[PDB]
Amino acid sequence: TNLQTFELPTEVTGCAADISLGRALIQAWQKDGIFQIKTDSEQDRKTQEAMAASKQFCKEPLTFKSSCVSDLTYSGYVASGEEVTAGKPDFPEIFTVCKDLSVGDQRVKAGWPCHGPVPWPNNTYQKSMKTFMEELGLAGERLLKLTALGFELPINTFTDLTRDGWHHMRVLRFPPQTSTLSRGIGAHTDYGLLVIAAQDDVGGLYIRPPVEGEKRNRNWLPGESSAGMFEHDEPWTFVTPTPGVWTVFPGDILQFMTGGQLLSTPHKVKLNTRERFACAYFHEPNFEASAYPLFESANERIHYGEHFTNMFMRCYPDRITTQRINKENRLAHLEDLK
Ligand SMILES: NC(=[NH2+])NCCC[C@H](N)C(=O)O
Ligand SMILES: O=C(O)CNC(=O)C(=O)O
Ligand SMILES: [Fe+3]
């Protein structure tokens, strides 16, 4: 399937044109599971600078890369083969950028799970990634206003959840395939409101569109992980690399809040004949936000930070971050926040 591309206005005000655009965005997700947004010169420049920083960092020796880790936050380095999806190793190397909180921050002092300072490789890499993430966040907020408008909801419905949102980014390098291994990342869904992603010209992202009659697991429930689901089953859409766009698809929270009117798009990565750089950005609720059903009055909620924490613990069962959460009973804070 050949994807739709939209140009977003710099500001979303709720004018009648914004409602029509929002309607189109929703309908593109309901048809294809994904759409593209055009990038302007600055958005593209910041994307390329981040990609270049990623390539330069990956050239560092492994001993140095592996030192960029923290027992407070999941930010930092993930070696190729380290992450687990559905019990199988994923092959990118990754640098994850979560909210960059100093040890003087009150949430860090209180010992909240996943809160702490990014173990940056250096200040030059830091600046490239922070500038990119700030730009990505402006796009996320436009998209959330448009999504609310397309559902004829109050314009701030989703952005009210993203104040000091737990936005984060996975800066990825996928190695080349071998004749017997081509799994980059197993099939999965991501966890928050939106996923905005950039990729180089190599290719390897596949997404699953909505399928009439197909039951979808609710990955915010422990008994219904979406990891590995549909891995070997049609249909999978190849997201062809296209110059001058970012891709956008929903995460688990949007699926929950919309009652399945939007689905959290399953996706996976195949290793190609060349190494592949990509960046995946997650526009998320505040860690303390409680997502709720928009169209139902049911009692179910998703505590976003609980979902993030549960997911990252399953991704990284042996990481020092996970060990410290378990040792210090940091999950108790979530019970308290709830
Ligand atoms: N941290 C991530 N977004 N990881 C994406 C891959 C899927 C992840 N390993 C999982 O089990 O859910
Ligand atoms: O590499 C890509 O284009 C897709 N990346 C992801 O889905 C991810 O890391 O969660
Ligand atoms: Fe993903």
Coordinates of C-alpha atoms and ligand atoms in Angstrom, one line a residue:
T1 CA 0.0 0.0 0.0
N2 CA 1.2 3.5 -1.0
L3 CA 1.0 5.9 1.9
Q4 CA -0.7 9.2 2.2
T5 CA 1.3 12.3 2.9
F6 CA 0.0 15.4 4.7
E7 CA 1.4 18.8 5.4
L8 CA 0.6 20.1 8.9
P9 CA 0.0 23.8 9.6
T10 CA 2.5 25.3 12.0
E11 CA -0.3 26.1 14.5
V12 CA -3.5 24.2 14.9
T13 CA -6.3 26.5 16.1
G14 CA -9.5 24.6 15.5
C15 CA -10.5 26.4 12.3
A16 CA -12.8 24.5 10.1
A17 CA -9.9 23.5 7.8
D18 CA -8.2 21.9 10.8
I19 CA -11.3 19.7 11.4
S20 CA -11.3 18.5 7.9
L21 CA -7.5 17.8 8.1
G22 CA -8.0 15.9 11.4
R23 CA -10.8 13.9 9.8
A24 CA -8.4 12.9 7.0
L25 CA -5.6 12.0 9.4
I26 CA -7.9 9.7 11.4
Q27 CA -9.2 8.1 8.3
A28 CA -5.7 7.5 7.0
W29 CA -4.8 5.7 10.2
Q30 CA -8.1 3.7 10.0
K31 CA -7.3 2.6 6.4
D32 CA -3.6 2.2 6.3
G33 CA -2.4 2.2 9.9
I34 CA 0.1 5.0 9.2
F35 CA 0.7 8.2 7.2
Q36 CA 3.5 10.5 6.3
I37 CA 4.0 14.1 7.2
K38 CA 6.1 16.4 5.1
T39 CA 9.2 17.9 6.7
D40 CA 10.3 21.5 6.1
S41 CA 13.9 22.6 5.7
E42 CA 14.6 22.9 9.5
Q43 CA 12.8 19.7 10.4
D44 CA 14.8 17.9 7.8
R45 CA 18.1 19.6 8.8
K46 CA 17.6 18.5 12.4
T47 CA 16.7 15.0 11.3
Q48 CA 19.9 14.7 9.3
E49 CA 22.0 16.1 12.1
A50 CA 20.6 13.5 14.5
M51 CA 21.2 10.7 12.0
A52 CA 24.8 11.8 11.5
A53 CA 25.3 12.0 15.3
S54 CA 24.0 8.5 15.6
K55 CA 26.4 7.2 12.9
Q56 CA 29.4 8.9 14.6
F57 CA 28.5 7.5 18.0
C58 CA 28.1 4.0 16.7
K59 CA 31.7 4.1 15.5
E60 CA 32.9 4.4 19.1
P61 CA 34.3 1.3 20.7
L62 CA 31.9 -1.0 22.4
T63 CA 33.5 -0.4 25.8
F64 CA 32.7 3.3 25.6
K65 CA 29.2 2.8 24.2
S66 CA 28.4 0.3 27.0
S67 CA 29.5 2.8 29.6
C68 CA 26.6 5.1 28.6
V69 CA 24.1 3.4 31.0
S70 CA 22.3 4.3 34.2
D71 CA 20.7 2.4 37.0
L72 CA 18.0 5.2 37.4
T73 CA 16.7 5.7 33.9
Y74 CA 16.4 3.5 30.8
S75 CA 18.2 6.2 28.8
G76 CA 21.4 5.2 27.2
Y77 CA 22.9 2.4 25.2
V78 CA 21.5 -0.9 24.2
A79 CA 23.8 -3.3 22.4
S80 CA 22.7 -5.3 19.3
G81 CA 21.1 -8.5 20.6
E82 CA 20.4 -7.1 24.1
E83 CA 16.7 -6.1 23.9
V84 CA 14.1 -8.9 24.1
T85 CA 10.8 -8.9 22.1
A86 CA 8.6 -12.0 22.6
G87 CA 11.5 -13.9 24.1
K88 CA 13.8 -13.3 21.1
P89 CA 16.7 -10.9 20.8
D90 CA 16.4 -7.8 18.7
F91 CA 19.4 -6.7 16.7
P92 CA 19.7 -2.9 16.5
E93 CA 22.1 -1.1 18.7
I94 CA 20.2 1.8 20.3
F95 CA 20.6 4.9 22.3
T96 CA 17.5 5.7 24.2
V97 CA 16.7 9.3 25.2
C98 CA 14.1 9.7 28.0
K99 CA 13.3 12.8 30.0
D100 CA 16.7 14.2 31.2
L101 CA 16.2 14.7 34.9
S102 CA 19.1 15.6 37.3
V103 CA 19.7 13.9 40.6
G104 CA 18.4 17.1 42.1
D105 CA 14.9 16.7 40.6
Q106 CA 12.3 15.8 43.3
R107 CA 11.0 12.8 41.4
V108 CA 14.6 11.4 41.2
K109 CA 15.1 12.1 44.9
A110 CA 11.9 10.3 45.7
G111 CA 13.1 7.3 43.7
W112 CA 10.4 7.2 41.1
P113 CA 11.1 4.4 38.6
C114 CA 12.7 5.3 35.4
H115 CA 13.5 8.9 36.4
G116 CA 17.1 10.1 36.1
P117 CA 19.8 11.8 34.0
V118 CA 20.6 10.6 30.4
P119 CA 24.1 9.2 30.3
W120 CA 25.0 11.2 27.2
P121 CA 28.1 10.3 25.2
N122 CA 29.1 14.0 25.0
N123 CA 27.5 17.4 24.9
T124 CA 27.6 17.7 21.1
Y125 CA 25.5 14.5 20.6
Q126 CA 23.2 15.8 23.4
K127 CA 22.6 19.1 21.7
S128 CA 21.8 17.4 18.3
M129 CA 19.3 15.0 20.0
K130 CA 17.6 17.6 22.2
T131 CA 17.1 20.0 19.3
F132 CA 15.6 17.2 17.2
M133 CA 13.3 16.0 20.0
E134 CA 12.1 19.6 20.6
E135 CA 11.1 19.8 17.0
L136 CA 9.5 16.4 17.0
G137 CA 7.5 17.5 20.0
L138 CA 6.1 20.4 18.2
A139 CA 4.8 18.0 15.6
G140 CA 3.4 15.7 18.2
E141 CA 1.4 18.5 19.7
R142 CA 0.0 19.5 16.3
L143 CA -0.9 16.0 15.6
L144 CA -2.7 15.5 18.9
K145 CA -4.7 18.7 18.4
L146 CA -5.7 17.5 14.9
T147 CA -6.6 14.1 16.2
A148 CA -8.9 15.6 18.8
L149 CA -10.5 17.8 16.2
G150 CA -11.0 14.9 13.8
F151 CA -13.0 13.1 16.5
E152 CA -14.9 16.3 17.2
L153 CA -13.5 16.5 20.7
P154 CA -12.3 19.5 22.5
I155 CA -9.0 20.6 20.9
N156 CA -7.0 20.1 24.1
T157 CA -8.3 16.6 24.9
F158 CA -5.0 14.8 24.3
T159 CA -2.5 17.7 24.8
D160 CA -4.0 18.0 28.4
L161 CA -2.3 14.6 29.0
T162 CA 1.1 15.5 27.5
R163 CA 2.1 18.5 29.7
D164 CA 5.6 17.5 30.8
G165 CA 4.9 14.4 28.7
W166 CA 7.2 11.4 29.0
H167 CA 8.5 11.9 25.5
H168 CA 11.4 9.7 24.5
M169 CA 13.3 8.6 21.4
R170 CA 15.1 5.4 20.3
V171 CA 18.1 6.2 18.1
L172 CA 18.7 3.0 16.1
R173 CA 21.3 1.3 13.9
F174 CA 20.4 -2.0 12.4
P175 CA 23.2 -4.2 11.2
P176 CA 23.1 -6.0 7.8
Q177 CA 21.3 -9.3 7.6
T178 CA 22.9 -12.7 7.2
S179 CA 21.6 -15.6 5.2
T180 CA 19.9 -17.0 8.3
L181 CA 19.1 -14.0 10.4
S182 CA 17.0 -11.1 9.2
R183 CA 15.0 -10.2 12.3
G184 CA 15.7 -6.6 13.3
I185 CA 12.9 -6.0 15.8
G186 CA 10.1 -8.5 16.3
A187 CA 6.5 -7.5 15.7
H188 CA 5.3 -5.2 18.5
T189 CA 3.2 -2.1 19.2
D190 CA 4.5 0.9 21.0
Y191 CA 3.2 2.3 24.1
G192 CA 2.1 5.9 24.1
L193 CA 0.0 8.3 22.1
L194 CA 2.0 8.7 18.8
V195 CA 5.1 7.4 17.1
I196 CA 6.9 9.8 14.8
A197 CA 9.7 8.2 12.9
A198 CA 12.5 9.0 10.6
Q199 CA 14.6 6.6 8.5
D200 CA 17.4 6.7 6.0
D201 CA 17.2 5.4 2.4
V202 CA 17.9 1.7 3.1
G203 CA 14.6 0.3 4.1
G204 CA 13.3 -2.3 6.6
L205 CA 10.2 -1.0 8.5
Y206 CA 7.0 -3.0 8.0
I207 CA 3.6 -2.1 9.6
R208 CA 0.3 -4.0 9.9
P209 CA -2.8 -2.1 8.8
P210 CA -6.1 -2.6 10.4
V211 CA -7.6 -6.0 9.4
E212 CA -11.4 -6.5 9.2
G213 CA -12.4 -9.0 11.8
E214 CA -8.9 -9.4 13.3
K215 CA -8.8 -9.4 17.1
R216 CA -6.0 -7.1 18.5
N217 CA -4.3 -7.7 21.8
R218 CA -4.4 -4.9 24.3
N219 CA -0.8 -4.6 25.1
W220 CA -1.4 -2.6 28.3
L221 CA -2.8 -5.8 29.8
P222 CA -0.2 -8.3 31.1
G223 CA -2.1 -11.3 29.6
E224 CA -2.4 -9.6 26.1
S225 CA 1.1 -8.6 25.0
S226 CA 1.3 -7.6 21.4
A227 CA 4.9 -8.7 21.2
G228 CA 5.5 -11.2 18.4
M229 CA 1.8 -11.2 17.4
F230 CA 1.3 -11.8 13.7
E231 CA 5.0 -12.0 13.0
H232 CA 4.6 -14.6 10.3
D233 CA 1.1 -13.8 9.1
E234 CA 0.0 -11.5 6.2
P235 CA -0.6 -8.6 5.8
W236 CA 2.5 -6.5 6.3
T237 CA 3.0 -3.1 4.5
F238 CA 6.6 -2.1 3.6
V239 CA 7.1 1.5 4.6
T240 CA 9.3 2.5 1.6
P241 CA 11.9 5.1 2.5
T242 CA 10.7 8.4 1.1
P243 CA 12.7 11.7 1.2
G244 CA 11.4 14.6 3.2
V245 CA 8.9 12.9 5.5
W246 CA 8.4 11.5 8.9
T247 CA 6.0 8.6 9.5
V248 CA 3.3 8.7 12.1
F249 CA 1.2 5.9 13.7
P250 CA -0.8 5.4 16.9
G251 CA 0.5 3.8 20.1
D252 CA -1.3 1.8 22.8
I253 CA -2.8 4.8 24.6
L254 CA -4.6 6.1 21.6
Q255 CA -6.0 2.6 20.9
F256 CA -7.3 2.5 24.5
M257 CA -8.7 6.0 24.6
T258 CA -10.5 5.6 21.3
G259 CA -11.9 2.2 22.2
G260 CA -10.2 0.7 19.1
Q261 CA -11.4 3.3 16.7
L262 CA -7.7 3.8 16.3
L263 CA -5.4 0.8 16.6
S264 CA -1.9 0.8 18.0
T265 CA -0.1 -0.1 14.8
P266 CA 1.9 -3.4 14.9
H267 CA 5.2 -3.1 13.3
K268 CA 8.6 -4.9 12.9
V269 CA 12.0 -4.3 11.2
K270 CA 13.8 -6.6 8.9
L271 CA 17.6 -6.4 8.5
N272 CA 18.6 -5.4 5.0
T273 CA 21.7 -6.0 2.9
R274 CA 23.1 -2.7 4.3
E275 CA 23.1 -1.2 7.8
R276 CA 20.1 1.0 8.4
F277 CA 19.7 4.1 10.6
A278 CA 16.4 5.2 12.0
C279 CA 15.0 7.3 14.8
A280 CA 11.7 6.5 16.5
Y281 CA 10.2 9.2 18.7
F282 CA 7.4 8.6 21.1
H283 CA 5.0 11.4 22.0
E284 CA 3.7 10.3 25.4
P285 CA 1.4 11.2 28.2
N286 CA 2.9 12.6 31.4
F287 CA 4.3 9.7 33.5
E288 CA 1.5 10.4 36.0
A289 CA -1.3 10.6 33.5
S290 CA -4.3 8.3 33.7
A291 CA -5.7 7.6 30.2
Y292 CA -9.4 7.0 30.1
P293 CA -12.0 5.9 27.5
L294 CA -13.3 8.8 25.5
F295 CA -16.4 7.1 24.1
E296 CA -17.4 4.8 26.9
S297 CA -18.7 5.6 31.2
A298 CA -16.4 2.7 32.0
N299 CA -14.0 2.5 34.9
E300 CA -10.9 1.2 33.1
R301 CA -7.8 3.4 33.0
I302 CA -4.2 3.1 32.0
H303 CA -1.7 4.7 34.2
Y304 CA 0.9 5.7 31.6
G305 CA 4.0 5.5 33.7
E306 CA 3.0 2.1 35.0
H307 CA 2.7 0.9 31.4
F308 CA 6.0 2.5 30.4
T309 CA 7.8 0.9 33.3
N310 CA 6.2 -2.6 32.8
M311 CA 7.2 -2.5 29.2
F312 CA 10.8 -1.4 29.7
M313 CA 11.3 -4.0 32.4
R314 CA 10.2 -6.7 29.9
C315 CA 12.4 -5.3 27.2
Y316 CA 15.5 -5.2 29.5
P317 CA 15.1 -7.9 32.2
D318 CA 18.8 -7.9 33.2
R319 CA 19.7 -4.2 32.8
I320 CA 21.0 -2.5 35.9
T321 CA 17.9 -0.2 35.7
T322 CA 15.5 -3.1 36.1
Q323 CA 17.7 -4.6 38.9
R324 CA 17.5 -1.5 40.9
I325 CA 13.7 -1.1 40.4
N326 CA 13.3 -4.6 41.8
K327 CA 15.8 -4.3 44.6
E328 CA 14.4 -1.0 45.9
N329 CA 10.7 -1.9 45.2
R330 CA 10.3 1.1 43.0
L331 CA 7.1 -0.2 41.6
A332 CA 5.5 0.7 44.9
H333 CA 5.6 4.4 43.8
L334 CA 3.2 3.5 41.0
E335 CA 0.8 2.0 43.4
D336 CA 1.0 5.2 45.4
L337 CA 0.6 7.5 42.3
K338 CA -2.5 5.4 41.5
Ligands
LIG1 N1 11.1 0.0 24.0 C1 10.5 -0.3 22.9 N2 9.7 0.6 22.3 N3 10.7 -1.4 22.3 C2 10.1 -1.8 21.0 C3 10.2 -3.3 20.7 C4 9.3 -4.2 21.5 C5 9.7 -4.4 23.0 N4 10.9 -5.2 23.1 C6 8.6 -5.1 23.7 O1 8.8 -6.2 24.2 O2 7.5 -4.5 23.9
LIG2 O1 13.4 1.2 12.9 C1 12.2 1.6 12.6 O2 11.9 2.3 11.6 C2 11.1 1.2 13.6 N1 11.6 1.3 15.0 C3 10.7 0.8 16.0 O3 9.6 0.4 15.8 C4 11.1 0.9 17.5 O4 12.3 1.0 17.7 O5 10.2 0.8 18.4
FE3 FE 8.3 0.3 17.6

